[PDB]
From a paper:
The chaperonin TCP-1 ring complex ([name]) acts as obligate folder for >10% of cytosolic proteins, including he cytoskeletal proteins actin and tubulin. Eight paralogous subunits (CCT1–CCT8) assemble into a hexadecamer of two back-to-back rings, enclosing a folding chamber. This architecture facilitates nascent protein recognition at the apical domain with a built-in lid, as well as binding and hydrolysis of ATP in the equatorial and intermediate domains to drive lid closure for open-and-close conformational transition. We trapped endogenous human [name] with substrates (actin, tubulin) and cochaperone (PhLP2A) at different folding stages, for structure determination by cryo-EM.
Particles in the most abundant class (29.7% total closed particles) were refined to generate a 3.0-Å reconstruction, where we identified the additional density as tubulin (left). Thus, the tubulin density likely reflects a mixture of different tubulin forms, including α-, β-, and γ-tubulin (sharing 31–41% sequence identity), although several isoforms of β-tubulin were among the most enriched peptides from affinity purification. We therefore built our model on the basis of tubulin β-2A chain (TUBB2A), the highest enriched tubulin peptide. A tubulin monomer comprises the N-terminal nucleotide-binding domain, taxol-binding domain (TBD), and C-terminal domain. We traced the N- and C-terminal domains of β-tubulin, which adopt a nearly completely folded conformation (inset). The TBD, however, is not visible in the density, likely reflecting its unfolded state inside [name]. Tubulin is localized at the inner walls of one cavity, to the level of apical domains. The N- and C-terminal domains of tubulin interact mainly with CCT3 and CCT6, and partly with CCT8 and CCT1, involving residues that are highly conserved across tubulin isoforms and different orthologs. Of note, the CCT3/6/8 subunits constitute the hemisphere identified with low ATP binding and hydrolysis rates. At a lower isosurface threshold, the largely disordered TBD is seen to extend into the cavity center, toward the other hemisphere (CCT4/2/5/7) that exhibits strong ATP binding and hydrolysis, with potential interactions with the C termini of CCT1 and CCT2. Altogether, for the first time, a tubulin folding intermediate is observed in atomic details inside the [name] chamber, where nearly folded regions are held by interactions with the [name] inner walls, facilitating unfolded regions to attain native structure in the central space.
Residue numbers in the entry:
A (entry chain D): 21 to 539
B (entry chain E): 2 to 538
C (entry chain B): 2 to 527
D (entry chain H): 312 to 388
E (entry chain d): 21 to 154
F (entry chain b): 108 to 214
Write the structure that this text describes.
């Protein structure tokens, strides 16, 4: 007879958290894998969202249980660190907790469960690293295969042939492939434009802007010299309170004339540099482009794009080599950007786009134009392309590749079963639970594919025991096979981060024993 | 209760005399008197358990849920959400005792309740309430004269402060701060004696700043002969300590001058604009140069300043405080001996104050800083910095120390001292009994009742101390009458002796006289009421 | 009779007055509720709580900090509010002990209710408790040891104190890691106690062991547009100027002219004033310019043309930490460059953490301020890690201030209880029976510590009491196996400051709650 | 400053001067005079006392008591 | 320092009972003696009753406090045993309790008050018998 | 009081079956101690009568009849001896007559 445990609310709270987490995991289990389907989510305001992304789904469904909120945060963290695996990580967490259920029932302490899970996590990191193979970013076929694998799960998979090479070119254009250890995907701009179909998605090497052109008649410019103007082309206005007191009739005409002359001198100093395309920053508190200024620029045959946003300035400069000018005195030729073409293109009556294509200084920036027949499919195309870019980012960060189709999860189950048999004690039960919990991703892949999950997962385990560690669930043939012939590969970072974050979240939730209702 | 008018007519026609007479109430006569007495007795029996060293505290909760633990009768009755008008009168009585004296706020209420409780039995026997009030006035006069007779006197000099420290310890014995009994008494005495006008016999409490900061221990409470401010130096790279500080006190913001009248400075040319720019620059430089040429090593402004002024102070090695409040500016001037300057042009080396130490003080893991100004030459201002483990004990420490300061003030106003522990009350009760024996009119009963009421304070002390009330009080009364010693009272602390002059239990004569007078006057005003009218709901 | 139970009620509709037993009942029940709530978080094997606010934001916190727990609950019992404020003041004074002071106060009040039932006056109880507080103070102070002189032993004591502070918290998973982090970060302050100098950046993602202490400094601000991104041998000007449509402080000033030409001349003059300001800045010989305020397009362009990296919109804390880390002087006037000290660091680059870019200052000069990047799987994990790190850093700062240390694992509480017991059995009267209760509460502290682990608390506290009665003043709980051991060897040591504060604040709050015999509530504002 | 009009008029009738909207002619005929001026503490409040005016056609009662209504009924009496 | 008396509800109950009893006594005090007057009592049903009899008055006014009910029963018992004195007995009871008020406040135990009252009662019966004439 | 001690023990983390076990052992010990301390005087008629008077006095001490305990003790003892060994307590009729003093009561 040990300690009576006079209180049962800690155990009830643990069981409630485990139940909530397993419920979330089982709710999103259906959106896992190439044969997984999407969920529609109608917000309280009526914003509809069709998606296959686990992080998106969990953030969008306003879960209420604390454990479910924590799983949402877990999926967001996985989306940050890897950008792919946001469903697998939640499923793994839910499964680990569902195993903690029976462990707790057996009568093991939550601290012992947590420590044994940490042990299993370290061993599993070892196993995944051993499974991994190195990759060179020059292996364009390997990159294409990673991107196709990332896209197979999404609505954009019949267009994978189109969006994988784009997702590889984009990332390979915004990094120095020899020195890069990461990538900032803010260098990759995505522009969602309704209309057409997803086969109309495009990779624009130059710059794309949604701002409209103010000139009528001047839509296309060849051999374009472009200048960014952070000052206002309108009547002068000091930063102090200023007035113009008229006391004689002559001063009225004088005021109008001097205003005209000021504006004309401005536009002449602009024209004198050879600038024929003019991007004007957005200006509140003062008119950035007066009617006089627009008249004069149009007469001088200069394309004008105002309302540029103060957050797109660094991007536009990085793109077309321009330098932002805030005083007319410093507006010279060395502050311009040379582009082989600047055109206002129409998209079959579905809007207009300004494309600045060709650049003498195309500095590590690219844009992707996302087309589509519906707002929902456009949003999911954007999310999926982001997932592909994040997969390439994982490959850039960690030069290691792992097979897919549940092969890593199955190898984990197997080798951690062995580890458990070697770690005799009460940690053995917990490690065996960890293994059987990691055996759930292949089971889910099979279930979603439409196979018999038990038979499929047993065949997988048997073949991995024989030694085919690169063996997985071939949803094309309908059974098990060497998954590299199907070319299902994913960065090691995805699986490693998923496992790590799921284990940390499980340990945190296991360290909880009470819930309070603050105020 | 009863209604204003219950006839509606001897003819059946409507009889409406007072507005909303049907919703209004009225109580008349002896039942009204007894209702008053019941309410007053309820209040007094609430308060009587907070009397003496072994007295317990009360936990007051306001409308918004803030908690106040206290033994102060005035604070209790002010925090008390009373609806009865006689209870409101008793709250006013206690507040009056606090205003005039600053101590006795519970004795006044207990005594008034006892007087009304005895008037209850006198009214039952059929005496006119005005006759009761007049007998109470007579007995109160007798008791006041007996207090003047048995009073003692203490020396209020600054050389030997032991009598004043004993008085303050007696005052603070009943408060939660009796854990630091002598430290608190010492700092109250030193505070009033530092800031007290001996010739005028006046003590201005605006010159005593009582500041509290959570953290530390109650034992950390100390007396600063100077000022503490809730500010820090204006620039984070300024030094946090300044020794031999010559202080410039200024009520001019370190900013370009600005007329109070509606003004428009017109810029009409690039030359005008550049002249304005140079004027602003030179104004900032000239301000800082004037402060430096005055010889000051520290500046204290009331109205804050801007980046140029802050950096110029830093460059010129002039630590500075900004956004100091008017009262603290005044206290800093008074303490450092400096004069408050309204503009820099009017600043001279003689208008500066001197403090031997100006320091910025931290409070652990808080990020909040305080500024101490001390080591002045002859600071006529002072600060009491109170520490403790919670805001409840900090607030109680504040009010208890206020009680102690008020007691020392009352000593400075009149040095005569009676000894407490109920001894003075027992002696006045004996004197009143003797005068009632010599009184042959019908007021004899009222005076005997007044004596029996005066005797409730020793009984209350005994009860709160667990002793048997009647036994203890009768024995000490018998001893007082046998061996003439009006310093025989209740051994609340169980020191063995009943001699309060030996236990150093000390009260102020004006305090006791004010207690008796206020209780008697309010009891008279209550007994004189025989009709209440109140609106419905 | 009584205020409430009188033929006339003297109160406004909605008020109330609980008398002696009712008041003591509600007070003891509230305090003991608070204490039972906050325990089970006590000690290495303590477990966390979910706060789960109920507002329209429905905040969600996972905490082990007693101060945080008490702050984030809707309390309506006045005595409970007293204990809550006590724990808050403990958290303000030091950064640890916020659960131990509350548990101690609650146990003392439980024993006090027991004594009231034993028919003891709640003034004899406070008297005996004051005597016991004196005895415990003296025993603790005599048991304290100081190693600030020996630098190596002081470093070891710092590592042990950080480890003991983190043991109870979610960071015990990587305790050997976060201990080193916290100790290095508190030593980088070079004796200063400014805990604002230690900045903590919580970056969602990564494991909790991916967290680190930057060898230099990190800043979550942006660089201008046409300005460099890498700078070697950086000379830095930290400023607080306007550099944003900076107007002459004369506020009645207005431009009143008769010509648009004159308006344009004045506008050009404003621009020339800004240009001259920028030129005065550049005459300091700098490569980096940090401003507390914004930097508008024109000075941004000027700094870009000059080849200077101009970081804008750092805050008061940002520029303070930068001055501490580089050595510069926060300036707002540039007419005396010889007097403005510049900051230096070997390199300033832009690094990635998660998906966000940050300014990285490497090779800094002073380093008296620090940046800690906290990585984690959930925002709850990150917030709890920040709270735990704040605890550890506060304790290490308080120890650098006062190097006195005191062994943990219930050794200190048991020693104090031993002293109180000697005083009690040598003192006559019922004050002895109250001192014994004081000691019982002191013993109930490690009792709870052991209970939360799952051991035979009664047996282990009996062993500890026997050891401290025999004279093994260093015996404490060994929470690895669940036995008693030598705290001096196991490295379980606490700050004398924190233990003394726990003791004294608990005794003080219990005293102030015990003096209450009436609770008079006023009609809620509703 | 902000002295009430009635107290100012009483100070005038007591000390023997006149109230001046302009400070340009402050002669001894318009200035007032008393034998003693003091600021003292009176029961929690601070009061300014002008005493010693022999030509005073005014007086000020200062009523003490333990309640607002006590003092009000004293004033009515 | 004796026993703390951690509970105050006993004293509150004693004082409430004493107050109720004294209130009844003072309410019927006016119907005592040759110069005493009668009370009219209109029942809930509207049955009017004018009376000078203490037992009748107390039985007809539906007193609610327990002590007042007990005084009603006391007056009924006096009406049974003697048929005269039903007002004097209630007044005496109320007055004895009104004295218990100040005794309790002085700090005497209710048991001591009861025993001393029994002593005084026996002595008073002795005194009244001495006064009596056959 | 037993349940108060049991809550204390549960807080001490003792199983409420170990508590019942120890309580049963304690009940056995208390039973045996009580039974060994018990004394019988039914044989001696005079001492048995004295024990009856003492038991009646002890039973009435706690009650309102402690005022006239020496009277009501004799009442109760005589009334229980008039039953001549039978236990029929309905045989003892009690008539409550309002009026008179409590000492006017009789058998
Ligand atoms: N063509 C395929 N054949 C077999 N398995 C696949 C294929 N494509 C993807 N998978 C598997 O599907 C999983 C990815 O599913 P996905 O819906 O992206 O979940 P997550 O968002 O968690 O990555 C990976 O574990 C991968 O092994
Ligand atoms: N140490 C002591 N011994 C005996 N009597 C004391 C002692 N200290 C104070 N008293 C008495 O307690 C009475 C109540 O004073 P107290 O309640 O402390 O202040 P207040 O009445 O202003 O609230 C005083 O009349 C005083 O004589
Ligand atoms: N490794 C350890 N071994 C034994 N006791 C420990 C250990 N770490 C902490 N403690 C004990 O746990 C207590 C700290 O628990 P904590 O949750 O920090 O409470 P608090 O918030 O009140 O400081 C201290 O009293 C200390 O003695
Ligand atoms: N003519 C009288 N003169 C003086 N006293 C009288 C006279 N008649 C009656 N009493 C007194 O009045 C009392 C009777 O009053 P009563 O209304 O009968 O009250 P109770 O019903 O309690 O006796 C007696 O105590 C008696 O002494
Ligand atoms: Mg995917
Ligand atoms: Mg006092
Ligand atoms: Mg801690
Ligand atoms: Mg009669
Ligand atoms: Mg019995």
């Amino acid at each position: 007879k040990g300690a009576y445990q006079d209180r049962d609310k800690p155990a009830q709270i643990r069981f409630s958290n485990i139940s909530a987490a397993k419920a979330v995991a089982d709710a999103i289990r259906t959106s896992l894998g190439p044969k997984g389907m999407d969920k529609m989510i109608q917000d309280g305001k009526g914003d509809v969202t069709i998606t296959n992304d686990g992080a998106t789904i969990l953030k969008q469904m306003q879960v209420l249980h604390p454990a479910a909120r924590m799983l949402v945060e877990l999926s967001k963290a996985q989306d940050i660190e890897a950008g792919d695996g946001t469903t697998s990580v939640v499923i793994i967490a839910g499964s680990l907790l569902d195993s903690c259920t029976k462990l707790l029932q057996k009568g093991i302490h939550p601290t012992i469960i947590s420590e044994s899970f940490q042990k299993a996590l370290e061993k599993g990191i070892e196993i995944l690293t051993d499974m991994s193979r190195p990759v060179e970013l020059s292996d364009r076929e390997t990159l294409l295969n990673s991107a196709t694998t990332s896209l197979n799960s999404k609505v954009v998979s019949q267009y994978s042939s189109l969006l994988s090479p784009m997702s590889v070119n984009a990332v390979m254009k915004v990094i120095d492939p020899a020195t890069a250890t990461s990538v900032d995907l803010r260098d990759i701009k995505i522009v969602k434009k309704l209309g057409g179909t997803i086969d109309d998605c495009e990779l624009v090497e130059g710059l794309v802007l949604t701002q409209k052109v103010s000139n009528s008649g001047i839509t296309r410019v060849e051999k374009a010299k472009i200048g960014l103007i952070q000052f206002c082309l309108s009547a002068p206005k000091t930063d102090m309170d200023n007035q113009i007191v008229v006391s004689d009739y002559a001063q009225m005409d004088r005021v109008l004339r001097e205003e005209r002359a000021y504006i004309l001198n401005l536009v002449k100093q602009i024209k004198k540099t050879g600038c024929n395309v003019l991007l004007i920053q957005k200006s509140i508190l003062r008119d950035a482009l007066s009617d006089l200024a627009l008249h004069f620029l149009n007469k001088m045959k200069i394309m004008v794009i105002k309302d540029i946003e103060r957050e797109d300035i660094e991007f536009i400069c990085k793109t077309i080599g321009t330098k932002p000018v805030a005083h007319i005195d410093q507006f010279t030729a060395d502050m311009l950007g040379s582009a082989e073409l600047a055109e206002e293109v129409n998209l079959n009556g579905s809007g207009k786009l300004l494309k600045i294509t060709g650049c003498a200084s195309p500095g590590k920036t690219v844009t992707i134009v996302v087309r589509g027949s519906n707002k929902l499919v456009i949003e999911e195309a954007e999310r999926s392309i982001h997932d592909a870019l994040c997969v390439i980012r994982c490959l850039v960060k960690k030069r290691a590749l792992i097979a897919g189709g549940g092969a890593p999860e199955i190898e984990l189950a197997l080798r951690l079963t062995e580890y458990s048999r070697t770690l005799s004690g009460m940690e053995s039960y917990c490690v065996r639970a960890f293994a059987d919990a990691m055996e759930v991703i292949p089971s889910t892949l099979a279930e979603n594919a439409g196979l018999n999950p038990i038979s499929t997962v047993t065949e997988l385990r048997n073949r991995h025991a024989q030694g085919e560690k690169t063996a997985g669930i071939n949803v094309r043939k309908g059974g098990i096979s060497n998954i590299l012939e199907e070319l299902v590969v994913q960065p090691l970072l995805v699986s490693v981060s998923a496992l790590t974050l799921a284990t940390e979240t499980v340990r945190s939730i296991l360290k909880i024993d009470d819930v309070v209702n603050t105020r | 209760a009863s209604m204003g008018t219950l006839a509606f007519d001897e003819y059946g026609r409507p009889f409406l005399i007072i507005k909303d007479q049907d919703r209004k109430s009225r109580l008349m006569g002896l039942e009204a008197l007894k209702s008053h007495i019941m309410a007053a007795k309820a209040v007094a029996n609430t308060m009587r358990t907070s009397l003496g060293p072994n007295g317990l505290d009360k936990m007051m909760v306001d409308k918004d849920g803030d908690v106040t633990v206290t033994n102060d009768g005035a604070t209790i009755l002010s925090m008390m959400d009373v609806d009865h008008q006689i209870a409101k009168l008793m709250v006013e009585l206690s507040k009056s005792q606090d205003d005039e004296i600053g101590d006795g706020t519970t004795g006044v209420v207990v005594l008034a309740g006892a007087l009304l409780e005895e008037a209850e039995q006198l009214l039952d026997r059929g005496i006119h309430p005005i006759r009761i009030a007049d007998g109470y006035e007579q007995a109160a006069r007798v008791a006041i004269e007996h207090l003047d007779k048995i009073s003692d006197s203490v020396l209020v000099d600054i050389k030997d402060t032991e009598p004043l420290i004993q008085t303050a310890k007696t005052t603070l014995g009943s408060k939660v701060v009796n854990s630091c009994h002598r430290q608190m008494a010492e700092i109250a005495v030193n505070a009033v004696l530092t800031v007290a006008d001996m010739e005028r016999r006046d003590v201005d409490f605006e010159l005593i700043k009582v500041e509290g900061k959570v953290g530390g221990r109650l034992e950390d409470t100390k007396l600063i002969k100077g000022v503490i401010v809730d500010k820090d130096f204006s620039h984070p790279q300024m030094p946090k300590k300044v020794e031999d500080a010559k202080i410039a006190i200024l009520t001019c913001p370190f900013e370009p001058p600005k007329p109070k009248t509606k003004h428009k400075l017109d810029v009409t040319s690039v030359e005008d604009y550049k002249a304005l720019q140079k004027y602003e620059k030179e104004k900032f430089e000239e301000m800082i140069q004037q402060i430096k040429e005055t010889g000051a090593n520290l500046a204290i402004c009331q109205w804050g300043f801007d980046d140029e002024a802050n950096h110029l102070l830093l460059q010129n090695n002039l630590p500075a405080v900004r956004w100091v409040g008017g009262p603290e500016i005044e206290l800093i001037a008074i303490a450092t001996g400096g004069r408050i300057v309204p503009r820099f042009s009017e600043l001279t080396a003689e208008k500066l104050g001197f403090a031997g130490l100006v320091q910025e003080i931290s409070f652990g893991t808080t990020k909040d800083k305080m500024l101490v100004i001390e080591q002045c030459k002859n600071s006529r201002a002072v600060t009491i910095f109170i520490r403790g483990g919670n805001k409840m004990i900090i607030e109680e420490a504040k009010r208890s120390l206020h009680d102690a300061l008020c007691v020392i003030r009352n000593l400075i106003r009149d040095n005569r001292v009676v000894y407490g522990g109920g001894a003075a009350e027992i002696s006045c009760a004996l004197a009143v009994s003797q005068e009632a024996d010599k009184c042959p009119t019908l007021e004899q009963y009222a005076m005997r009742a007044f004596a029996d009421a005066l005797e409730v304070i020793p009984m209350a002390l005994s009860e709160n101390s667990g002793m048997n009330p009647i036994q203890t009080m009768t024995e000490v009364r018998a001893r007082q009458v046998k061996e003439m010693n009006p310093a025989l009272g209740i051994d609340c602390l169980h020191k063995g002796t009943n001699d309060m002059k030996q236990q150093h239990v000390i009260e102020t004569l004006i305090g006791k006289k004010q207690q008796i007078s206020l209780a008697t006057q309010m009891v008279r005003m209550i007994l004189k009421i025989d009709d209440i009218r109140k609106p419905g709901e | 009779a009584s205020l409430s139970l009188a033929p006339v009620n003297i109160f406004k509709a909605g008020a109330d007055e609980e008398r002696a037993e009712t008041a003591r009942l509600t007070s003891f029940i509230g305090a003991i509720a608070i204490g039972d709530l906050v325990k089970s978080t006590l000690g290495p094997k303590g477990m966390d709580k979910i706060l789960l606010s109920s507002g329209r934001d429905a905040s969600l916190m996972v905490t082990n900090d007693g101060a945080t727990i008490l702050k984030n609950i809707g309390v309506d019992n006045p005595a409970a509010k007293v204990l809550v404020d006590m724990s808050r003041v403990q958290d303000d004074e030091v950064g640890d002990g916020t659960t131990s002071v509350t548990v101690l106060a609650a146990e003392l009040l439980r024993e006090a209710e027991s004594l009231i039932a034993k028919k003891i006056h709640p003034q004899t109880i406070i008297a005996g408790w004051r005597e016991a507080t004196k005895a415990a103070r003296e025993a603790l102070l005599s048991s304290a040891v100081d190693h600030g002189s020996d630098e190596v032993k002081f470093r070891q004591d710092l590592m042990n104190i950080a480890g003991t502070t983190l043991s109870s918290k979610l960071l015990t998973h990587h305790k050997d890691h976060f201990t080193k982090l916290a100790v290095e970060a508190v030593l980088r302050l070079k004796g200063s106690g400014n805990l604002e100098a230690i900045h903590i950046i919580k970056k969602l993602g990564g494991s909790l062991a991916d967290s680190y202490l930057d060898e230099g400094f990190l800043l979550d601000k942006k660089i201008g547009v046409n300005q460099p991104k890498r700078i070697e041998n950086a000379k830095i000007l930290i400023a607080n100027t306007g550099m944003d449509t900076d107007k002459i402080k004369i506020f009645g000033s207005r431009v009143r002219v008769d010509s648009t030409a004159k308006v344009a001349e004045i506008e050009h003059a404003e621009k020339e004033k800004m240009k001259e300001k920028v030129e005065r800045i550049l005459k300091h010989g700098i490569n980096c310019f940090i401003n507390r305020q914004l930097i508008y397009n024109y000075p941004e362009q000027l700094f870009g043309a000059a080849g200077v990296m101009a970081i804008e919109h750092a805050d008061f804390a940002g520029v303070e930490r930068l001055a501490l880390v580089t050595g510069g002087e926060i300036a707002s006037t540039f007419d005396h460059p010889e007097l403005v000290k510049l900051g230096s660091c070997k390199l300033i680059e832009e690094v990635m953490i998660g998906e966000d870019k940050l300014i990285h200052f490497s090779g800094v000069a002073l380093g008296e301020a620090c940046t800690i990047v906290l990585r984690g799987a959930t925002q709850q994990i990150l917030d709890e890690a920040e709270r735990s790190l704040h605890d550890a850093l506060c304790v290490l700062a308080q120890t650098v201030k006062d190097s006195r240390t005191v062994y943990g694992g219930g050794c200190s509480e048991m020693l104090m209880a031993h002293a109180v017991t000697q005083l009690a059995n040598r003192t006559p009267g019922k004050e002895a029976v109250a001192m014994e209760s004081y000691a019982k509460a002191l013993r109930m502290l490690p009792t709870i510590i052991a209970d939360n682990a799952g051991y035979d608390s009664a047996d282990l506290v009996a062993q500890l009491r026997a050891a401290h009665s025999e004279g093994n003043t260093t015996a404490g709980l060994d929470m690895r196996e669940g036995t008693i051991g030598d705290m001096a060897i196991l490295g379980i040591t606490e700050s004398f400051q924190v233990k003394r504060q726990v003791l004294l604040s608990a005794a003080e709050a219990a005293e102030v709650i015990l003096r209450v015999d009436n609770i008079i509530k006023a009609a809620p504002r509703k | 400053g902000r002295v009430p009009e009635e107290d100012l008029k009483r100070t005038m009738m007591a000390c023997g001067g006149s109230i001046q909207t302009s400070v340009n002619a402050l002669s001894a005929d318009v200035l007032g005079r008393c034998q003693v001026f003091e600021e003292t503490q009176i029961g929690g409040e601070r009061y300014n006392f002008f005493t010693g005016c022999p030509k005073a056609k005014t007086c000020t009662f200062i009523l003490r008591g333990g309640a607002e209504q006590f003092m009000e009924e004293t004033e009515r009496s």
